Design a protein around this ligand. Structure first.
Ligand SMILES: Cc1cc(/C=C/C#N)cc(C)c1Nc1ccnc(Nc2ccc(C#N)cc2)n1
Ligand SMILES: C=C(C)[C@H]1CCc2c(c(C)cc(O)c(=O)c2O)C1
Ligand SMILES: [Mn+2]
Ligand SMILES: [Mn+2]
Lengths: 555, 407
């Protein structure tokens, strides 16, 4: 019975490079007899073919015992050929996320560990796959072979096998839109909803379809059946999770142990709500090197301990129902941490997750919330192809005040306020026009680059003045200090005039928390005021209030 | 026959990752590519082709017909540079009207050099990575490729000879997929010559859309100083700041008389009457600002930079330049679009408008500096984009002080 051949893919070596010419390693008499037997059947099966002495390429072959069995296995080390082989288009870049899959009543697993060798290797590329089985005692020309099929270990085998398999399955899937087919490895997985009665029919039709290419598929009941252990998860017919997450009990934690714990908590955070890892990742501020046996701050133990009370019992996520709306809920945890859950039906999470701010000294809650939303939006597009509806802890009025006045363009997709503390809020608002009746403070700073001594001060319209001597400080620091002094010594409403672009850049950035306590103090002061108007003027342009205070702090 | 093409020596093809696409966009692209494949325009490719260029979908406006758009930015940069045998219409920017015409479909009637095809590979991704991505490569000249207008030039040159000889005053310029047609006609004959043009094209072998521009109506924006009867200390402080800044562009500016008004530590709301020395100085400074800048020239080997500032309540200002403080163009968009709902839609609309103007004036797109977080822009620009080209851009994260001074 005729069978359609499987077209070969043209392969080339990277430009300027030639095939590998690696020396064969000396083997034991025992390993050679094993390789000869193995190679003999492979040759009988058409997988390899003996070659003459003309071929000048070589790749080392090895023999490894199988978990202490009576059998041997051959390993051709293609590392060197892989460096000289062209790059291919990986179509298994990403694995699909469990929260995106659809629930299927029935799902069968068909093996194709044989259809792998029905895949031929481009004729003109075969020579590069040459290898040599050494002869017993090195007294005769070693046996030379080259591959006729995709070799195990070669750079392009995965891509070519997967694309060849896809091309064959392409018409079957299309014609049968009531089933899903997934080619992870050597086992084929087919899911569906139709009664098991006709789902078995579909399977037989697939096996028939694969026979067109003479690919047989082996008419037993595959050992694999739900649930499946795949890519760190457990997949069940109607639910999924991570696999088993176990947090060690330890009296000693070393950089590695903490990195290992953070990894488990991150992986666990996709389905276990509330997971926190800030106080932990903070203890690994920045080194390469295990081990050191660092200690755990009273926060690490408190934050981690709370984790154990989350992973206490198993939590499962449901699968995606395209006919139902996707909803994402976010909560602030503090210390720049945020957690979110995505679901379609109340309390039935498809998946969950966390968000952590990036490097920076000044930030605010609204900006953090926005970053979280963009992240969730992208992940959603990748997993479900759409943007979820958001439930956020921030009043519509706050958000509007924020984006209309923020210097940057910003946007959040369709959302709704959810009243669950702590809410996100704007802590202070600078004024747009100078305040009438309020005292005007002209501030300034200066520091000597060399001595590091400086002064910070202010003068006001009411004659109020102050100049404070400072050590260990920079120009930028002194200028922030001056603003702080004016805030400290003024009433609930005040006009402040500065010449510092740097200070304005920081307050125009509108932070509500900072890595610099100086800025934090200022923030604390802003929060307590009723009205504050910050004005800027150019240095040294003959201006009152400014020309004075400048002389007072320059020295 | 096929005019040959190669890449710049040094350089392999593009290998750009395809970004996540929504379900509506994927279905549109699957449907479109299915029919382009039928028609021989594109062909499925195998894994031996490691190149890739992003692709997405855009509905042109007020309509429900998707367009497929390929982001050839990377390929363009990477493909050698295709001089023939244009430099610019210095009078297109002068013409009363200009109608923009999508002629990209013409390209699909010229075959692409088989040895270059691999370089035009693109992927239609699947939701949640569930099935492999559909891979294709072009067989014909692709829209959005810079080689595309270049190679097809010869053929377009003689396709327009008739119309051009019978209308020697009309200016016709071509940029990427787009034909720009400019004339001083009255705005109703102007339309006849256009809807002629395309009937003259659609004979000659969605070009029905038009985007009318009026270069004679653009809308520059010098610096202006306020005209007030009573000045507070704050008004004068802001004025001296603005003038100090402008003195970096115009050398003759002077402040000293205005500064010497603010002698003493006064209350910001106190009214200050102007001296005659002041009011003279302010006057001489207004004059200087009416003159144009000194030593400002375009240098076509240099990049154009565009800066944009959000001025609030729907207004946006911008400047185009090559050298700092040497503006070649400045402007404002107190238009509606976009909001009052959406900041990002407005910004996207501004970028397109400024790009269009930059093409008309210099024949190339500028490199944008954008007042927005990279993560916010990337997640949303494609949802509001409507142009067949795409400019380069970078992100600004520090609020510029000069924000106010341009409004
Ligand atoms: C990604 C994937 C991995 C495996 C399996 C890999 C392995 N090992 C098996 C299949 C069939 C799929 N693909 C799809 C596509 C759409 N819905 C689903 N739903 C779905 C999958 C498994 C279970 C179960 N039990 C329930 C529902 N799976
Ligand atoms: C060139 C100068 C007049 C000096 C002295 C004061 C002075 C100077 C500079 C650079 C910056 C300031 O912000 C400032 O407040 C100054 O007083 C430099
Ligand atoms: Mn200063
Ligand atoms: Mn000073």
């Amino acid at each position: 019975v005729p069978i359609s051949p499987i077209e070969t893919v043209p392969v080339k070596l990277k430009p300027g490079m030639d095939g590998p010419k690696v020396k064969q390693w000396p083997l034991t008499e025992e390993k050679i007899k094993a390789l000869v037997e193995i190679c003999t059947e492979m040759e009988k099966e058409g997988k390899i073919s003996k070659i003459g002495p003309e071929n000048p390429y070589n790749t080392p072959v090895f023999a490894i015992k199988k978990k202490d069995s009576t059998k041997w296995r051959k390993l051709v080390d293609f590392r060197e050929l892989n460096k000289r082989t062209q790059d291919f288009w990986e179509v298994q870049l990403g694995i699909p996320h469990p929260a995106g899959l659809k629930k299927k009543k029935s799902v069968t697993v068909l093996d194709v560990g044989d259809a792998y060798f029905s895949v031929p290797l481009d004729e003109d590329f075969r020579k590069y796959t040459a290898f040599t089985i050494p002869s017993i005692n090195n007294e005769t020309p070693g046996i030379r072979y080259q591959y006729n099929v995709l070799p195990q270990g070669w750079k392009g085998s995965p891509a070519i096998f997967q694309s060849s398999m896809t091309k064959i399955l392409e018409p079957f899937a299309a014609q049968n839109p009531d089933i899903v087919i997934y080619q992870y490895m050597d086992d084929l997985y087919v899911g569906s909803d139709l009664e098991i009665g006709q789902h078995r029919t579909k399977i037989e039709e697939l096996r028939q379809h694969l026979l067109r290419w003479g690919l047989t598929t082996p008419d037993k009941k595959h050992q694999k059946e739900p649930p499946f252990l795949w890519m760190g998860y457990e997949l069940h017919p109607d639910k999924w999770t991570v696999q088993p997450i176990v947090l060690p009990e330890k009296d000693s934690w070393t950089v590695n142990d903490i990195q290992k714990l953070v990894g488990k908590l991150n992986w666990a955070s996709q389905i276990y709500p509330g997971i926190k890892v800030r106080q932990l990742s903070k203890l690994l501020r920045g080194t390469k090197a295990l081990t050191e046996v660092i200690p755990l701050t009273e926060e690490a133990e408190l934050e981690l301990a709370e984790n154990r009370e989350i992973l206490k019992e198993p939590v499962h996520g449901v699968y995606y129902d395209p006919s139902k709306d996707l909803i994402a809920e976010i909560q602030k945890q503090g210390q720049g941490q945020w957690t979110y859950q995505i679901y379609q039906e109340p309390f039935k999470n498809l998946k969950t997750g966390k968000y952590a701010r990036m490097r920076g000294a000044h930030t605010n809650d609204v900006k953090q919330l926005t970053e979280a939303v963009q992240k969730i939006t992208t992940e959603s597009i990748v997993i479900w192809g759409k943007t979820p509806k958001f439930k956020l802890p921030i009043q519509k009025e706050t958000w509007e005040t924020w984006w209309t006045e923020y210097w940057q363009a910003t946007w959040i997709p369709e959302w709704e306020f959810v009243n669950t503390p702590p809410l996100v809020k704007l802590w202070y608002q600078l004024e747009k026009e100078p305040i009438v009746g309020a005292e005007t403070f002209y501030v300034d700073g200066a520091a000597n680059r060399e001595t590091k001594l400086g002064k910070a001060g202010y003068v006001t319209n009411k004659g109020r003045q102050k100049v404070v001597p400072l050590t260990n400080t920079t120009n930028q620091k002194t200028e922030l200090q001056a603003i702080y002094l004016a805030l400290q010594d003024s009433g609930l409403e005040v006009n402040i005039v500065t010449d510092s672009q740097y200070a304005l850049g920081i307050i125009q950035a509108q932070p509500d928390k900072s890595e610099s306590e100086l800025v934090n103090q200022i923030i604390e002061q802003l929060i307590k005021k009723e009205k504050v108007y910050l004005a800027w003027v150019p240095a040294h342009k003959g201006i009152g209030g400014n020309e004075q205070v400048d002389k007072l702090v320059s020295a | 026959e096929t005019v040959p093409v190669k890449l710049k020596p040094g350089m392999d093809g593009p290998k750009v990752k395809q970004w996540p696409l929504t379900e509506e966009k994927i279905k549109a692209l699957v449907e479109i590519c299915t029919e382009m494949e039928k028609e021989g325009k594109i062909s499925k490719i195998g894994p031996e082709n490691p190149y890739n260029t992003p692709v997405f979908a855009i509905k042109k406006k007020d309509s429900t017909k998707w367009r497929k758009l390929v982001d050839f930015r990377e390929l363009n940069k990477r493909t050698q540079d295709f001089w023939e045998v244009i430099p610019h219409p210095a009078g297109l920017k002068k013409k009363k009207s200009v109608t923009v015409l999508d002629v990209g479909d013409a390209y699909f009637s010229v075959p692409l050099d088989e040895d270059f095809r691999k370089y035009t590979a693109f992927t239609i991704p699947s939701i949640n990575n569930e099935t492999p991505g559909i891979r294709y490569q072009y067989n014909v000249l692709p829209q959005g490729w810079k080689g595309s207008p270049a190679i097809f030039q010869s053929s377009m040159t003689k396709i327009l000879e008739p119309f051009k000889k019978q209308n020697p005053d009309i200016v016709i310029y071509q940029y990427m997929d787009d034909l720009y047609v400019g004339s001083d006609l009255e705005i109703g004959q102007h339309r006849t010559k256009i809807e002629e043009l395309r009937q003259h094209l659609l004979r000659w072998g969605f070009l029905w859309m038009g985007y009318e521009l009026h270069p004679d109506k653009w809308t520059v924006q010098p610096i202006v100083l306020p005209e007030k009867d009573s000045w507070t200390v704050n008004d004068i402080q802001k004025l001296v700041g603005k003038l100090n800044w402008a003195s970096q562009i115009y050398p003759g500016i002077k402040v000293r008389q205005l500064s010497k008004l603010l002698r003493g530590t006064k209350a910001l709301t106190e009214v200050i009457p102007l001296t005659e020395e002041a009011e003279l100085e302010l006057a001489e400074n207004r004059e200087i600002l009416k003159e144009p800048v000194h030593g400002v020239y375009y240098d076509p080997s240099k990049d154009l930079i565009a800066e944009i500032q959000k001025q609030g309540q729907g207004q946006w200002t911008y400047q185009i330049y090559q050298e700092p403080f040497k503006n070649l163009k400045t402007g404002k968009y107190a238009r509606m679009r976009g909001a009052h709902t959406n900041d990002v839609k407005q910004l996207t609309e501004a970028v397109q408008k400024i790009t269009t103007e930059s093409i008309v004036i210099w024949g190339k797109t500028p490199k944008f500096k954008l007042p927005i977080q990279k993560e916010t822009w990337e997640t949303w620009w494609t949802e509001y984009w409507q142009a067949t080209w795409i400019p380069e851009w970078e992100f600004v994260n520090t609020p510029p002080l000069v924000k106010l001074w341009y409004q």
